[PDB]
Amino acid sequence: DPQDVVVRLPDVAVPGEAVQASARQAVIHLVDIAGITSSTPADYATKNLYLWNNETCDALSAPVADWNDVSTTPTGSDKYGPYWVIPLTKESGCINVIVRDGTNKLIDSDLRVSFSDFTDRTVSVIAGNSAVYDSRADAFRAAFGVALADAHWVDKTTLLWPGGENKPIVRLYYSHSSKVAADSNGEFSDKYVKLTPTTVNQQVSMRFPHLASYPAFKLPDDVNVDELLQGETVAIAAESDGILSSATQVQTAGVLDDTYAAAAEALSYGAQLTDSGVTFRVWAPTAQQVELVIYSADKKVIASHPMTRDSASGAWSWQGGSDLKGAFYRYAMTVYHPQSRKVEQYEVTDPYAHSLSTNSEYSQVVDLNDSALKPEGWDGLTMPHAQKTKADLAKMTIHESHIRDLSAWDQTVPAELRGKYLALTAQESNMVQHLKQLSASGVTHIELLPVFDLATVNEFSDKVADIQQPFSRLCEVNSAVKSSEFAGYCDSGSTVEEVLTQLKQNDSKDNPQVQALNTLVAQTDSYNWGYDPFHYTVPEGSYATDPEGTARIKEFRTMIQAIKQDLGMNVIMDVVYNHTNAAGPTDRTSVLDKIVPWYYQRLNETTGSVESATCCSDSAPEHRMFAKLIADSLAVWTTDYKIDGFRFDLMLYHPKAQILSAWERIKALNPDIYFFGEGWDSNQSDRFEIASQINLKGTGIGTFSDRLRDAVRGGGPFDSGDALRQNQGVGSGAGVLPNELTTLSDDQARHLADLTRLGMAGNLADFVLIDKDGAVKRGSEIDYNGAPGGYAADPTEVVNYVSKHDNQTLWDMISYKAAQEADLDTRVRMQAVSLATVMLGQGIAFDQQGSELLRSKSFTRDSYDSGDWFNRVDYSLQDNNYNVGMPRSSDDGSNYDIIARVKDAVATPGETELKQMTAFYQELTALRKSSPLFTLGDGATVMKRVDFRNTGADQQTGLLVMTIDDGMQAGASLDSRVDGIVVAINAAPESRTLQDFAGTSLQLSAIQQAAGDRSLASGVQVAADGSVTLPAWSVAVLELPQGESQGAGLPVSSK
Ligand SMILES: OC[C@H]1O[C@@H]2O[C@H]3[C@H](O)[C@@H](O)[C@@H](O[C@H]4[C@H](O)[C@@H](O)[C@@H](O[C@H]5[C@H](O)[C@@H](O)[C@@H](O[C@H]6[C@H](O)[C@@H](O)[C@@H](O[C@H]7[C@H](O)[C@@H](O)[C@@H](O[C@H]8[C@H](O)[C@@H](O)[C@@H](O[C@H]9[C@H](O)[C@@H](O)[C@@H](O[C@H]1[C@H](O)[C@H]2O)O[C@@H]9CO)O[C@@H]8CO)O[C@@H]7CO)O[C@@H]6CO)O[C@@H]5CO)O[C@@H]4CO)O[C@@H]3CO
Ligand SMILES: OC[C@H]1O[C@@H]2O[C@H]3[C@H](O)[C@@H](O)[C@@H](O[C@H]4[C@H](O)[C@@H](O)[C@@H](O[C@H]5[C@H](O)[C@@H](O)[C@@H](O[C@H]6[C@H](O)[C@@H](O)[C@@H](O[C@H]7[C@H](O)[C@@H](O)[C@@H](O[C@H]8[C@H](O)[C@@H](O)[C@@H](O[C@H]9[C@H](O)[C@@H](O)[C@@H](O[C@H]1[C@H](O)[C@H]2O)O[C@@H]9CO)O[C@@H]8CO)O[C@@H]7CO)O[C@@H]6CO)O[C@@H]5CO)O[C@@H]4CO)O[C@@H]3CO
Ligand SMILES: [Ca+2]
Ligand SMILES: [Ca+2]
Ligand SMILES: [Ca+2]
Ligand SMILES: [Ca+2]
């Protein structure tokens, strides 16, 4: 088309520098983009700089602090703009500048000119842009070149772009093999499509509501999208004469979904065994070439196959023989990546990989149904615990565990199984026997921290050193140790563990030496929580005895079978679909973003940079093919690994619709699978309806409740310093046993009691209780940091807990918070009292591995990379890992002062306390499952049967009294043995007497009577008249015994 105006650069040269700063000088160019378009010779008399020294930048020589002084006018100027020569006292550091016309800012931003980064101290700026450029050419190309990525090709015919609104020429340029750039004639001569303004359709605004305010443009219905998506596309806008306004890169995930997803969703992906052979398929709708590279066991290329592109789906496939089973493979990609703007060439593992080589370098063809990859009996393995009804689900009592935390320290686990899946098969080890005991007593589910393929442990054992090994080994594999203050131990002949123990003696807030060595250990040990996804649907390799090939698959299943069959527990996996470990075209662990660049990651709407609000490389579960990958991945964990439930990490970054979609998909495989996650606020509500506590009401999708958690623990996860001690919780005596720093008022204490009672009734929005002032409140009317406290529809949608892998352990919180006068035995009872609010509540019960052993991390708040030393759990019951060194200073350094003040208040728990806490713990879990009344499942049923005494403004502070009705006003007798239950948690130093049940023949539960002196209710007195005397820091479960008819019980009061 020749009538089309040709888009071109300004008909002016790219500018050199006006002047170059001399000694004790800096030079600022203002590149006058408007006057480069020229017309009228520009007048710069009113341009001026405001120059001042503060504390961070002070190099200016004679800065005039008078804001109203506009006399710092240009030193000179040429056709490209003015420049300023600025005297200096020094050529290092920086200067502060605001660029003005008169007193108005041309750049609404205090500028810092760093001599350290601009060594010739000669920089350029442009009006309306806070960026400091090294040269006018750079700034010039910034203004008249490609920049950012704010154009959004969202379906076949709709481009959303700011830069093109009310511009005469708006075009989508595209180049198959090079980056769209101006000619030798300054002309953009690459091929393009023409764009005409239009109106955002309803389907596009529904799909992309965060973009609905973007100026919309239409493409011809006959544009060949497949051709444009093969290379670079750049949206370009231009004036009426053809001069370039702006040019930006294009985000294409919307049009990729509109063009390909319907066809692509019908296909299955990865290396798939069939009856004819093996079918390979990978989704790569923008790739120019995909070659399947086949590797021998020793990683030699033994074949290379150009794959067949299916043009409806953008998937690539190839079919080979059945003998390819066990073979290693990668996809050789030829694909444009917008981040580098190059057509990249690299081999990538399969995102649908189901088996891996060591350290995930190669994917491997596997048939997960092979009986060689199954323990004997696998196919008939069943759930030891039902999950079918809401009452089934409410019984869930979760023990959140980590593969190394379980066995790394257990000398009774065979050495070669320590830190391995197979440690769970060590039937006589302390660890497994302790777990069996916990299961007999009513822990029902093991929840496993990441056992999918994580990135952050090196699976080549030669490159790893663990604290149980010689310190010389640590030196060999970690070259930083050589130049560390611990270098001398390289010759010591002792283990790293022996050195860390030795370092305990002089370790202090002033000499944090244990943490110092451990930070080096952490770089090259086997330890990480593993919230760092490499491949979503392969087991982690470092947890296998053999990480090379399929061995880990059978070992994983042997563990799963042992937990269900040897230990009697169901299994929940933590899954982390909300982010990838890395993105872009070069990083070793960028898998998804090498194959389909900019599709699987969530990007900033204007820069196209991968967002990091999760921590890392944010994913895009709102995109259709990643939603499919998630669902397909869960299908394998469900069917092929027999996982009973999934906990979604940062579920709030997922659309509600996508989570429910995945759930219906998985429920069609197994109807009893349970989904829950972290449903905080992801700040993504502008893009879709997030999968949050609030939005998931009624769905049956569970969420961690932070309500009872914070009320019982005290404070919040972002407390530091004195606040860690001041913010006592119900479990540590808020308002009844104050420590020396706190100012908690009685009203504040009663408010925590409201959140705790609300949580023990399942944290429902509609539950009705009497609040701290004696007023009638619905759950949703109790405040929690401004949000409605109660949010659920059924208690199965709420997971209560007072300790978790992240943030401080319960014991460390009690240690921060307990008054000096609380002795060691009282603190053990505070731990049990805290856990009682979870274990005796209607919400699903969740707890950190080792709360029953008073688990400590030496005050470490965030132990994800703190190794075996700080995450130690001692199943030989010698101690609780308390006081083993100051925690990592980079995250807890601002807590050293309060740590040192509170740390040594009482002795460190030893074997007597550990056994006592475990008995306490098993007493609580046995109580939880002793009656269906504790686990009613259905919220309306909770509302009809659960009530509280000792409420209102004159309540006895810290005394929690819950009643569960099994009498006629409620409905049927769900429990044949009792007409009602009373739960009384006396979180207080005073003994207390209940008269609410005078005359009722109330009696103590048989479980607690049988524990005798060892019971949380030791010393409870039930008088003849039915009054109950509760010791300090006690938990009592009482019951109305049943006679041969459902009695009156404990009718809920209508309020
Ligand atoms: O001395 C205490 C503060 O110390 C530190 O501040 C120093 C800076 O670090 C240092 O760089 C330098 O400041 C320079 C600054 O960085 C440059 O940007 C520039 O400032 C000029 C600015 O760019 C112009 O726009 C203009 O300012 C006008 C402004 O735009 C206009 O809106 C109005 O300002 C009024 C505010 O709108 C109004 O809210 C109110 O201000 C409140 C304020 O909001 C409130 O927070 C409180 O101020 C606190 C402050 O928050 C504290 O942090 C602390 O200040 C210290 C800083 O933190 C350090 O950074 O204490 C303050 C309490 O005294 O109370 C204010 C009420 O008084 O009123 C505003 C004024 O009426 O008016 C101006 C009109 O000119 O001109 C600016 C310069 O004139 O140049 C700065 C160099 O002067 O120096 C700082 C030390 O002086
Ligand atoms: O994103 C990086 C962080 O990731 C990890 O954080 C995870 C948490 O550990 C985990 O518990 C969960 O958090 C959710 C939480 O469980 C839910 O309850 C809820 O959180 C809400 C909370 O309950 C409410 O109280 C309220 O918070 C208010 C708060 O009460 C109030 O005091 C104030 O907050 C101020 C702080 O008190 C004050 O100290 C300071 O905070 C600074 C901080 O000092 C500084 O170091 C820096 O923070 C860093 C941090 O040090 C880094 O380690 C890293 O944080 C990560 C965590 O460590 C991970 O464990 O990066 C941070 C910076 O990005 O900067 C802080 C300030 O920005 O000032 C605070 C105010 O500015 O106000 C708030 C009210 O706004 O609302 C809470 C909502 O967030 O939901 C949580 C979901 O985030 O999951 C986390 C997963 O990421
Ligand atoms: Ca320069
Ligand atoms: Ca791994
Ligand atoms: Ca580590
Ligand atoms: Ca956002």
Ligand SMILES: [Ca+2]
């Ligand atoms: Ca009954």
